[PDB]
């Protein structure tokens, strides 16, 4: 009822069920899709997932834990810019909204209604986000890495340099299942890795 | 950019060509050449004391403005808050009643 | 005028805390700015 | 360990039977056989969930947020089954598990625990989204008893001083992490910058452990120390300078 | 005989005796500074550098292990974070074990000092630094390096520094 | 392009900074700078500081104090952050904080 | 709850209740025990003692008067010591606010585990406050007597001058009723008026 999780069909669901995919009327509101809250949405079942994680995708659940990282570090610096605007902010603090805007509206961010993204593979979305947090680290090693040098990276100057990586990465999302076989998605998002690394290499 | 506001400021910038070169190369120039570095020392001084002062107005109108901000979040957004909290209570508290 | 008239629910009580606990934060966050920009202040005006 | 399982389609009744269940147990290996004893409840929000529906079943109307009124007293009556006794070696700690609905501490089911107990312990959605493990916030966090719980022959000698230390830098920490949000990084002070890099490696490294990671209280205090030589010796003002003298040093 | 210090030192009187031998004729007779201490001051690699940054000097790194022994290095420039190697060739290792022994330059190569955000170093030739140092100044490492062509210095190639001090001369 | 510095003072005064390198003509043949004639009326003191406060090339005014005070409506009437504005002792006139607009706006001081 | 005076029970027991000893965790925090909040903290008793007081105390209700109006200048003066810093303040208000933080640290403070403050009787009380209070008055004279001269008396001036008085009314609380007698005590603090009142006529 209003949309409220206090509700008592809410808060015994809430206290039974392993899993809540908590939908949120602000992301719905700016029609984002398919507008589960990566806040408040939980799952107990990663305690038992991380051993077919570490079986069938060795890489993901680091990826997992600093995406969830990435997201919640996006909430802390933007209710500190809708007060104090985006000066105060330190240039991993840019790049960590950078990569947290790709990660919300490229990786979290799915349409039901478009052939190639209507389902997701898992060879795929580990793929997306395995860049993406390359990504992070490299653009921040970047700006680390020049931490007291006669030049200091930043966006603006990533922004620059990367331009192509950044339309590449977006543009994963449109790789197609049914057209392109997993092992050339995977194929082309290695490219990327590529792409990225010697890139960043023209930063470093 | 300090706390998130641009504060100007100016830089003494010396573009090396002396447009008075030559004056007094007839007589006083040894004298001369002192009063030059004399005003220059005094117009580096100067940039620093309009630096200091672009600075001081825009902070006093920045802390101002920072200052107002604050004191309508204490003393109306927060009692605003307050008091509908509190008759959210009340209200919450009739309908527990009622029922 | 005295009151946001959201109206009285559990939600109502949701979203009044979470305000609560925002304007207290920028408050705090305007208040540290204030701060900030003081000491420069005070500083310049001994320079 | 005794473990008592009520599942969640377990009967309710048998919801309610089950803590007592447990510390009448705990009551006999404490009091009779003079075993220290830690009681874990694990839900006690599926508990008062038990107290409505046996309520209702007696046709007994509702009190505050639908709780039966007498929900203070049943509480009690779970937790007060606890404390040291005058001629036995015997002792029943509880740690309450309590599930805030809607994450609201002024809920019935917190606020009368918050009244009948010595103490609290939050853990924090902020903290576990940051994938921080286990994620007690030790801010809002407090142990009533701790004073007596620690210090020379109980545990070490520092501890009672570390903690209140602890505490204070992990505080300035969140502070100066808010301040370095506002000003950038080149207006904090040298002191701002460690309070900050203290509260980094606090979460990294004190809070942080792992579901397997068995500390010791002397483990725990020298990862304390470990963070808080950080500092400049005169910088942990609220440390005795004889415990700085004796601990401080490496 | 041995130079006077403002303060009290990881170094014995005994130390500073052998070390004013062996420095370079810049750097001896001179009175020493401190320009850093885990004791005096804040213990961690940024507060080394914090400190380090404001001078424009030779300086002396001495180390004391978890296994009391006295070790480190003689650097012809500041402890700072660096793009490259810096320094020069009157940089050399030290250790006592039990007296004082040095490796001065090679001439090999130009690895004499690097600074990083997570750590602090001397000597290269593949893996093996003369000298590494962990962000928080607790681990260290130490191998023979052709740098240098030095002993281990520390007493295991692996160590804790139990306390680190960084001395400028003035 | 950067900006330029403008002057209001007596023969002295904007001759010392004539040799201190500051003086130049704009392209339209409009000095950076007044000598003031006791002769001159304050209304074109006036209007020439309006000039410069007003003109995009004028980053800075220096003024003499003296005249500071004779200008002293329209000195304390600018209020703009971006020409900032230095009242400036001379060989016969008071000292560099006398009545000073600054100080007077400012309230920590001593 | 959280210290909200509104709760039922708290809001009815204060309708009743004539005394309010509002203790207070900022100040037991600060240690400054027996941390009662002179500010919220009130008795309507007041009146109900001036037959007592009249007889065996008869300064004391100026005494007490003045005390609560010092500690509240003094916490009004901390407004315009945030504002413009304590170097701003008039010569009267410097020595309020040194007075007041000498009643507050040396007469409502008290610790309870030593010999001295175990107990405190209240002749020993009236004593110390009427010492703090007649120094005050003193002290406040010699500024005010020297408002307009050439020489004008501050705070700073009585400190270098006596500050052995400021020293002796910090010690006053030392006295014990087991070692000392009851008229070793008042004589002890009716040599300290004596002290005071020469150390005053050396400047005024």
Same mark, same amino acid.
């Given at each position: ?68 990282? +990435? ?93 192509? +990586?950044?339309?590449? *990465? ?35 | ?33 002192? @009063? ?64 | ?14 979203? #009044? ?8 934060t920028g408050r705090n966050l305007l208040k540290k700015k204030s701060d900030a920009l003081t000491l420069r202040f005070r500083q310049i005006?001994?320079? | ?49 038990? *107290? ?39 002792? +029943? ?38 994938? +921080? ?12 008893? #701790? ?46 910058? @460690? ?40 910088? *942990? ?14 | ?17 052998? *070390? ?40 002396? @790194? ?109 | ?110």
């Open positions: 009822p209003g949309g409220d999780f206090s509700d008592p069909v809410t808060s015994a669901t809430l206290g039974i069920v392993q899993v809540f995919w908590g939908l949120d009327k602000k992301l719905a509101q700016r029609k984002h899709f398919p507008s589960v809250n990566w806040l408040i949405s939980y799952s107990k079942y990663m305690r038992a997932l991380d051993e077919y994680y570490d079986k069938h995708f060795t890489e993901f659940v680091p990826l997992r834990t600093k995406a969830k990282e +990435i997201l919640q570090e996006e909430e802390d610096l933007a209710e500190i810019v809708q007060l104090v605007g985006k000066a105060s902010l330190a240039e991993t603090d840019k790049i960590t909204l950078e990569v947290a805007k790709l990660i919300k509206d490229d990786f979290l961010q799915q349409n039901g209604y478009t052939p190639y993204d209507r389902f997701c593979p898992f060879y795929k979305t580990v793929g997306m986000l395995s860049n993406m947090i390359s990504f992070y680290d490299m653009a921040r090693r970047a700006v680390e890495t020049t931490a007291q040098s006669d030049n200091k990276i930043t966006w603006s100057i990533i922004r620059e340099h990367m331009g192509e +990586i950044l339309y590449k *990465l977006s543009s994963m999302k449109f790789k197609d299942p049914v057209k392109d076989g997993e092992a050339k998605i995977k194929a082309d998002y290695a490219q990327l890795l590529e792409d990225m690394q010697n890139a960043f290499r023209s930063l470093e | 950019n300090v706390a998130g506001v641009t504060l100007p400021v100016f830089e003494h910038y010396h573009e090396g060509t002396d447009s008075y070169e030559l004056t007094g190369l007839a007589r006083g120039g040894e004298q001369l050449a002192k @009063l030059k570095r004399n005003y220059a020392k005094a117009v580096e001084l100067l940039v620093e004391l309009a630096s200091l002062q672009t600075s001081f107005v825009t902070l006093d109108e920045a802390i101002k403005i920072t200052n107002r901000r604050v004191n309508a979040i204490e003393h109306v957004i927060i009692p605003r808050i307050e008091r509908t909290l509190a008759y959210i209570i009340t209200e919450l508290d009739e309908r527990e009643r009622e029922e | 005028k005295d009151r946001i008239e959201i109206f009285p629910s559990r939600m109502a009580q949701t979203i #009044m805390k979470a305000r609560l606990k925002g304007a207290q005006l001994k320079k | 360990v005794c473990l008592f399982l009520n599942l969640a389609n377990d009967p309710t009744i048998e919801r309610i039977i089950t803590p007592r269940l447990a510390l009448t147990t705990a009551e006999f290996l404490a009091y009779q056989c003079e075993k220290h004893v830690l009681v874990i409840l694990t839900d006690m929000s599926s508990y008062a969930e038990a *107290l409505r529906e046996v309520s209702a079943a007696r046709e007994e109307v509702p009190g505050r947020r639908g709780f039966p009124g007498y929900m203070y007293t049943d509480l009690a009556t779970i937790y007060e089954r606890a404390g040291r006794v005058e001629g036995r070696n015997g002792s +029943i700690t509880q740690i309450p598990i309590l599930t805030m609905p809607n994450d609201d501490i002024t809920h019935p089911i917190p606020d009368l625990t918050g009244y009948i107990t010595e103490g609290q312990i939050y853990v924090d959605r902020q903290l576990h989204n940051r994938q +921080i493990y286990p994620p007690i916030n030790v801010l809002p966090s407090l142990s009533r008893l #701790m004073k007596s719980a620690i210090g020379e022959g109980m545990t070490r000698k520092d501890h009672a001083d570390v903690s209140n230390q602890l505490y204070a830098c992990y505080a300035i920490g969140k502070d100066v992490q808010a301040m370095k949000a506002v000003v950038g990084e080149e207006a904090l002070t040298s002191d701002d910058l @460690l309070y900050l890099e203290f509260l980094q490696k606090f979460e990294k490294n004190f809070i942080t452990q792992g579901p397997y990671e068995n500390r010791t209280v002397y483990e725990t205090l020298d990862i304390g120390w470990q963070l808080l030589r950080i500092f400049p010796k005169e910088m *942990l003002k609220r440390i005795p300078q004889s415990t700085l003298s004796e601990f401080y040093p490496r | 005989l041995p130079i006077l210090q403002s303060h009290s030192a990881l170094l014995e009187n005994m130390h500073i005796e052998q *070390l004013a031998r062996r420095l370079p004729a810049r750097v001896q007779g001179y009175p020493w500074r401190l320009a850093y201490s885990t004791l005096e001051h804040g213990t961690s690699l940024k507060t080394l550098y914090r400190k380090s940054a404001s001078l424009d000097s030779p300086v002396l @790194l001495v180390i004391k292990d978890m296994d009391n022994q006295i070790f480190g290095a003689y650097a012809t420039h500041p402890f700072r974070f660096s793009d490259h190697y810096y320094g020069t060739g009157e940089t050399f290792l030290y250790t006592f074990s039990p007296n004082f022994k040095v490796f001065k330059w090679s001439g090999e190569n130009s690895y004499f000092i690097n600074g990083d955000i997570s750590s602090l170093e001397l000597g290269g030739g593949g893996g093996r630094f003369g000298l590494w140092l962990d962000a928080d100044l607790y681990h260290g490492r130490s191998n023979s390096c052709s740098t240098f062509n030095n002993d281990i210095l520390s007493k295991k190639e692996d160590f804790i520094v139990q306390d680190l001090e960084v001395w400028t001369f003035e | 392009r950067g900006k330029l510095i403008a002057v209001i003072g007596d023969e002295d005064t904007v001759t010392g900074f004539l040799l201190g390198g500051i003086g130049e003509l704009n392209k339209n043949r409009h000095p950076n700078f007044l000598v003031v004639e006791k002769d001159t009326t304050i209304n074109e003191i006036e209007d020439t500081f309006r000039q410069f406060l007003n003109r995009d090339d004028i980053g800075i005014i220096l003024i003499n104090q003296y005249i500071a005070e004779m200008v002293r409506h329209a000195l304390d009437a600018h209020q703009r952050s971006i020409p900032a504005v230095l009242e400036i002792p001379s060989k016969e006139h008071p000292y560099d904080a006398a009545k000073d607009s600054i100080l007077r706006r400012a309230k920590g001081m001593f």
